[PDB]
Amino acid sequence: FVEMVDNLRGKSGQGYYVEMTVGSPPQTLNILVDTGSSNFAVGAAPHPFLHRYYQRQLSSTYRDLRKGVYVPYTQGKWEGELGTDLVSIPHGPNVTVRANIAAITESDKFFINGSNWEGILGLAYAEIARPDDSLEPFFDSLVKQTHVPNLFSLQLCGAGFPLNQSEVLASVGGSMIIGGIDHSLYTGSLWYTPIRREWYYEVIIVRVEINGQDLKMDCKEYNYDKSIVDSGTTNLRLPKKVFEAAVKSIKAASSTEKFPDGFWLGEQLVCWQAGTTPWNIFPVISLYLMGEVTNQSFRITILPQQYLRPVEDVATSQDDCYKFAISQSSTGTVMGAVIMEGFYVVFDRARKRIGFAVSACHVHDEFRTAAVEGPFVTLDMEDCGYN
Ligand SMILES: CC[C@H](C)[C@@]1(NC(C)=O)CCN([C@@H](CCc2ccccc2)C(=O)N[C@@H](Cc2ccccc2)[C@H](O)CNCc2cccc(OC)c2)C1=O
């Protein structure tokens, strides 16, 4: 799998993309990797923020399905036209697949200026595909037409510092291993949690610690009304109630300095002198995930290097600046790229389960490192899922 290594590019704020080809002759496009949706979709018409797009009239292998699709994301939406075409992944498995493609004709707050991607790859399951679950998602088509194992894995790689467009261009953003686990991408052991149901990549959080201290809520609250691993979300997003007590406990640990309320809302930046960011003063966060064996459990631990998202100083100065990447949600927990950056995340679809190991890729300091650790027994653990 050395072919697929380093095939990703981008950053958490604007998503990580892979190079794919679309149609005959091969039309090259950068495609956002999204484990939190199920639609394969590309821009098909000129757009302010697009430097290239899908041209069906120029593809001999394109097929019109004569059907409209509208996909509303949590923030952003697009209207498109259903069709299939032959699709390949240049820095992926050497295969070609006819797969459903949504040709995006209209869009609002979807495309991002200077992001460098022109499409989205919905890696999740049919159940959440639009317009309905009869639209076979890409990875399904891929797995059904080829010999590639029902398995893919993601190493999303934060820099720990801001990237101007030409740097995101030139930097390695991580890896997408289609059909395997690459052992050079992680250090330590691989811990698996079960996928609760095959719509989103749904998992169950059993317990939450801020600097080892229990948030001590009814565990159900952590998975209200679901908890998903989502490539296409920046933040770690938590249910109103969970966010509240997580932000209270985090504010507590960080008393030393005080910050604008706008910072905690993910709305205002915060800046320190170059190299001066006080990582030690900010707490670690541990998430306990239901284990494979009964009553077993494991935890993933993230540092402020993960949940404090770097952004460029608008000022001329050399300040290191950040936005708080933990935000309120009314649709459940979303373990975004911010978390995913800490780990090598294995999507073992074949075995209906998600793996976690410490990323060779993750940002840390000298005193702390991100962790995946276990097992944990004491855990009162079954009623944690929401119905
Ligand atoms: C890659 C990050 C991206 C650049 C973005 N950056 C920032 C800084 O906000 C912008 C959008 N966004 C979040 C919302 C954040 C947010 C949340 C609340 C308020 C403000 C911002 C999101 O909606 N992402 C989409 C994919 C996507 C990628 C790029 C553009 C649009 C969508 C997921 O697929 C949704 N999964 C749940 C889901 C929900 C419904 C139907 C579903 O099935 C079809 C699946 C991000 O993190």
Side-chain angles (χ1 to χ4, degrees), residues 13-15 32 34 36-37 72-75 110 112 200 230 232-234:
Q14 305 179 325
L32 177 84
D34 187 10
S37 81
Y73 293 104
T74 275
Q75 184 240 252
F110 178 72
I112 283 154
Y200 296 83
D230 183 1
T233 291
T234 300

Side-chain angles (χ1 to χ4, degrees), residues 4 6 23 77 84 113 131 168 177 183 218 261 269:
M4 282 164 286
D6 291 355
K77 39 206 170 201
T84 59
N113 186 310
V168 15
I177 309 308
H183 294 276
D218 166 25
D261 310 307
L269 300 75

Side-chain angles (χ1 to χ4, degrees), residues 112-295:
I112 283 154
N113 186 310
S115 65
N116 202 319
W117 56 262
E118 31 264 351
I120 189 158
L121 184 58
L123 271 327
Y125 299 96
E127 206 193 284
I128 22 157
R130 253 79 171 172
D132 76 278
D133 69 349
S134 62
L135 225 233
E136 188 181 75
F138 176 93
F139 200 88
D140 294 321
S141 299
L142 199 249
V143 106
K144 215 153 135 84
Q145 286 157 60
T146 59
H147 278 14
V148 92
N150 196 8
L151 198 146
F152 74 92
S153 51
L154 231 47
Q155 181 197 228
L156 268 37
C157 295
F161 48 90
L163 261 41
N164 56 64
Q165 196 200 299
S166 81
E167 266 172 325
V168 15
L169 258 304
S171 155
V172 163
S175 295
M176 191 197 196
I177 309 308
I178 303 97
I181 294 166
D182 181 49
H183 294 276
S184 73
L185 258 43
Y186 71 109
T187 148
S189 259
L190 214 23
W191 282 87
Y192 293 84
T193 175
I195 297 162
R196 198 209 182 176
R197 187 184 132 202
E198 291 165 302
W199 52 334
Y200 296 83
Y201 291 98
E202 183 183 24
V203 290
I204 314 125
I205 299 159
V206 179
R207 176 179 154 90
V208 177
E209 286 170 12
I210 304 305
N211 262 354
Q213 193 187 246
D214 191 6
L215 256 248
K216 212 192 65 177
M217 291 188 180
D218 166 25
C219 72
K220 257 192 173 78
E221 220 74 18
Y222 308 141
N223 313 278
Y224 169 79
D225 60 311
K226 67 191 155 300
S227 294
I228 60 147
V229 180
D230 183 1
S231 214
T233 291
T234 300
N235 287 3
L236 161 60
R237 308 188 55 238
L238 285 101
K240 192 223 196 185
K241 200 148 176 281
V242 192
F243 175 70
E244 205 93 70
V247 164
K248 205 204 151 200
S249 190
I250 214 144
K251 266 159 68 180
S254 304
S255 316
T256 321
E257 259 144 332
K258 288 283 151 49
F259 314 89
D261 310 307
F263 165 69
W264 301 111
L265 270 311
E267 137 206 332
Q268 166 87 44
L269 300 75
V270 81
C271 305
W272 291 278
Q273 289 191 282
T276 287
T277 312
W279 306 104
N280 75 98
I281 187 218
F282 285 93
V284 135
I285 296 171
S286 309
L287 263 23
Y288 286 74
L289 260 18
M290 187 167 186
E292 295 221 271
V293 210
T294 349
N295 293 348

